[PDB]
Amino acid sequence: NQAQELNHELELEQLETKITVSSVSLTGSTLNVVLENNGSTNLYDFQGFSVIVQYYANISNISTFNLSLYNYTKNSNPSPYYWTINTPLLAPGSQATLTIILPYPPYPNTQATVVIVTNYGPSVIWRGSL
Amino acid sequence: LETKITVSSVSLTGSTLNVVLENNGSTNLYDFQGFSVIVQYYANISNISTFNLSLYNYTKNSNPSPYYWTINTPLLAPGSQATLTIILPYPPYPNTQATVVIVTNYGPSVIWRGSL
Ligand code: NA
Resolution in A: 1.7
Contacts of B60 (CB under 8 A, 6+ apart): B70
Residue A60 CA to residue A14 CA, distance in Å, equals 43
Q: Looking at residue A107, what DSSP letter applies?
A: P
Q: What would the DSSP string read from start to end of B15-62?
A: TEEEEEEEE-SSS-B--GGG-EEEEEEEEEETTEEEEEEEEEEE-S-S
Q: Which amino acid, A81?
A: Y
CA A25 to chain B, closest CA, distance in angstroms equals 20
CB A44 within 8 A of CB A88: yes
Report the candidate in B1, B28, B36 with the shortest Cα–Cα distance to residue B82.
B28
CB B8 within 8 A of CB B20: yes
Residues of chain A found within 8 Å of residue B53, distances taken between Cβ atoms: 54, 113, 115, 125, 127
Residue A113 touches partner B, C-beta closer than 8 Å: yes
Residue in B54, B55, B99 closest to A67 by CB: B99
Burial class (CB in 10 A: 0-12, 13-18, 19+), B52: middle
Burial class (CB in 10 A: 0-12, 13-18, 19+), A61: exposed
Residue B31 CA to residue B64 CA, distance in Å, equals 18
Does the distance separating the beta carbons of B101 and A67 come in below 8 Å? yes
Residue A70 CA to residue B108 CA, distance in Å, equals 11
Cα four-point dihedral sign B26, B28, B29, B34: negative
How far is residue A56 CA from its own chain's centroid? Answer: 18
Q: How many CB pairs under 8 A join A and B?
A: 39
Structural biology method used: X-ray
Q: Residue A4 phi/psi, 5° resolution? A: -70, 140
